Amino acid sequence: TQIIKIDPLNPEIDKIKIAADVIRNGGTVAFPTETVYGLGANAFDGNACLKIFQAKNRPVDNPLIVHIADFNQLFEVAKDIPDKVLEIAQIVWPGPLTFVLKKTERVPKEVTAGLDTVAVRMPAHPIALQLIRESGVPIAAPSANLATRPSPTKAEDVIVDLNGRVDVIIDGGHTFFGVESTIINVTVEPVLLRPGPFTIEELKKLFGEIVIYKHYAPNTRLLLVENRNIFKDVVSLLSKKYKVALLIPKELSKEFEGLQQIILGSDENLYEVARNLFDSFRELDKLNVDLGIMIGFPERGIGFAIMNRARKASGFSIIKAISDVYKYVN
Numbered sequence: 264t265q266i267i268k269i270d271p272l273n274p275e276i277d278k279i280k281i282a283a284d285v286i287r288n289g290g291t292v293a294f295p296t297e298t299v300y301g302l303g304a305n306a307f308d309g310n311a312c313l314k315i316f317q318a319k320n321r322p323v324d325n326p327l328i329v330h331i332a333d334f335n336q337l338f339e340v341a342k343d344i345p346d347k348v349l350e351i352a353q354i355v356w357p358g359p360l361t362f363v364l365k366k367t368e369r370v371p372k373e374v375t376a377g378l379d380t381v382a383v384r385m386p387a388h389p390i391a392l393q394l395i396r397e398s399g400v401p402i403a404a405p406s407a408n409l410a411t412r413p414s415p416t417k418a419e420d421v422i423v424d425l426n427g428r429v430d431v432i433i434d435g436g437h438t439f440f441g442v443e444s445t446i447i448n449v450t451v452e453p454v455l456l457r458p459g460p461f462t463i464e465e466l467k468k469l470f471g472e473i474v475i476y477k478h479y480a481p482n483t484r485l486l487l488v489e490n491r492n493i494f495k496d497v498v499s500l501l502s503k504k505y506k507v508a509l510l511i512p513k514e515l516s517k518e519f520e521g522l523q524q525i526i527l528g529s530d531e532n533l534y535e536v537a538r539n540l541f542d543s544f545r546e547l548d549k550l551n552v553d554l555g556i557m558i559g560f561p562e563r564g565i566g567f568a569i570m571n572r573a574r575k576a577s578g579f580s581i582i583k584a585i586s587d588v589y590k591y592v593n
């Protein structure tokens with residue numbers, strides 16, 4: 264694998280071209296975006312796209328997201344787009360919002376998992392946008408992590424996961440938001456399939472009528488305490504019988520000094536928490552603890568996405584009342 268260091272804010276076009284040549288030749292390239300790193304291939308090349316599944320060992324029926332750099336490309340992969348959707352796409356892109364649309368005959372089965380629809384988005388990241396532009400083709404790509412690991416948010420995550428399994432890894436720093444793009448299905452009348460950086464607050468203003476057994480990393484048991492008023496007592500109750508790690512905001516560090524902590528960021532800046540979330544899960548598994556205990560965050564703005572990912576990561580081990588603890592531990 265060729266690891267190429269590229270400036271994320273002012274990418275060296277000659278370096279981008281090296282990766283683009285790989286895409287055009289049917290190879291795979293891991294690249295940063297404003298959400299999480301992606302592993303991509305020529306969206307029109309089914310065989311190339313299968314290499315993505317092979318590198319991640321991803322179940323073949325889990326579809327990819329097609330990344331475009333301009334609207335001419337939108338019409339190459341999607342069709343029968345409602346006028347309102349087109350008008351809105353033109354004001355939210357490039358951005359962390361993915362639209363599920365009706366696909367064209369040019370989109371391979373490998374990309375859509377055989378579905379009649381295709382998920383599309385225009386990434387708001389210079390490296391991603393330039394890579395697509397220089398490649399001259401839309402790039403299909405899911406998150407760039409190995410099957411059972413958290414979505415990668417920094418180059419090191421991708422390297423540890425895919426080095427030796429992909430043709431190119433662009434080392435482009437840490438991703439901006441840290442959580443995957445918001446997904447909205449506009450082929451029905453619309454549904455929010457996944458919360459993300461494009462908040463539901465903003466979505467409802469554009470789409471007022473919007474409708475709101477896989478194991479998610481970490482492998483270490485993880486409890487999510489949504490009620491902050493019982494967090495201290497849940498910790499006291501568990502740290503007595505188990506070696507724990509607390510995923511908390513810096514504001515609560517002093518209250519639990521002595522116990523293993525993984526600082527997510529500040530309560531005054533949820534984007535910081537979102538940026539550090541997946542890597543905090545990776546750290547939890549590197550530590551030698553019986554279980555992780557994460558505190559909840561406000562479900563406003565990106566907080567909704569944070570909690571959505573947190574619930575999934577905890578295998579839905581939500582604690583609202585201290586008595587709930589009985590359900591996920593002795």
Ligand SMILES: Nc1ncnc2c1ncn2[C@@H]1O[C@H](COP(=O)(O)O)[C@@H](O)[C@H]1O
Nearest residue numbers: 325326327328363378380381382405406
């Ligand atoms: N046609 C589609 N309909 C609904 N969801 C889709 C579709 N295509 C892709 N997706 C979503 O995009 C995800 C892959 O991108 P990623 O979450 O970054 O790995 C899939 O797992 C689905 O959750």
Ligand SMILES: [Mg+2]
Nearest residue numbers: 405406407414
């Ligand atoms: Mg993924």
